[PDB]
Amino acid sequence: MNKTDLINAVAEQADLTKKEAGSAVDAVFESIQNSLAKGEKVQLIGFGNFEVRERAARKGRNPQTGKEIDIPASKVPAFKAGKALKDAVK
Amino acid sequence: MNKTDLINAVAEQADLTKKEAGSAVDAVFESIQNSLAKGEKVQLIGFGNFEVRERAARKGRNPQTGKEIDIPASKVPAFKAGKALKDAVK
DNA sequence: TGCTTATCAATTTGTTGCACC
DNA sequence: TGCTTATCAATTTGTTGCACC
C-alpha cells in the first residue's frame, strides 16, 4: 500500500470523494508530524502512540572504506503499536 | 495530542465536517491495521512505513525468580520513519 | 499507560550510495 | 517511496510486577 492506495481505501470506507479523502489523509500525517516536531506526543487510542525519543550515540560502518563511523546522539520519532494492532498482525 | 485533537486538526485542515473527519481518521487506522493483518506494508511518502516484522526468538529474565525466559518468535507491527519526519523531529 | 530486573541474552539497528530515498 | 556493508559496534529490546485509570 502506498498513500494513493490509502487515499482510495479511506474514500471508500468513510464515504468521501477522492479529493476529500486525500485532504483527510494528508492532514492526519502532516498533523502527526507537526506534533512530533514540537516534541509533543501523539496518542491515538485504538491505534498506537508516537513520541520523540533521544537515541544515544552509536557506530556505523562505511561500506566503501570499511571504516567505522560515529553516529551522534539524536532525537528520533518512535511508534508504539496498540493492542489492536499487535493482535491483528500476530 | 490525542485522537480527538487529531480529528479536530483534520476537520480544520482538510475543510471537513467533524463527522467526516471522524470517519476518515477511523478509516485511516482501520485500513492500516487491515493491510498489516495481511502482512502488507503501508508506505507513506515523507512520513514513513508501517510494516510487519518477523521478530526472532529471544531471551528475557523473570524479575522475581531470576530465571531466563524463552521469548518466542512472533510477528509484530513496526514503523520505519521516513526522511521528512526524521528531519522535522531532529 | 508507564515505569520497572539483570552477577540478563542476543537480536536488532544504523551506518552509504544511488543527483531522489 | 527501497535496495544496500560488516573479518561492524553497541545501543536497544524484551522479559514481569506494580500503581495508577
The structural domains of chain A, with segments of one domain joined by +, span 1-90
Element (H, E) at B59: strand B58-61
Q: What is the DSSP letter of B81?
A: E
B31 touching chain A per CB within 8 A = yes
Q: Which residue of A has its CA nearest to B14?
A: A23
Residue in the structure block whose three cell numbers are 463527522: B19
Query: Please, which contacts does B2-9 make with residues 24 or more away whose CB atoms are closer than 8 Å?
Result: B2/A42, B2/A43, B2/A44, B2/A45, B3/A43, B3/A44, B3/A45, B3/A46, B3/A47, B6/A28, B6/A31, B6/A32, B6/A42, B6/A44, B9/A27, B9/A31
Segments of chain A assigned E as strands: 42-44, 48-55, 58-61, 68-71, 74-81
**A3: how many CB neighbours lie within 10 A of its CB?**
17
**What are the chain B neighbours of A33 within 8 Å (beta carbons)?**
46-47, 84-85, 88
Task: Quote the minimal CA–CA distance from A30 to chain B in Å.
Answer: 8
Q: Nearest to residue A36, comparing CAs of B21, B52, B51, B79?
A: B79
Residue with cell 468521501: A16
CATH, domain range A1-90: 4.10.520.10
In this complex, do B33 and A84 lie within 8 Å of one another by their Cβ atoms?
yes
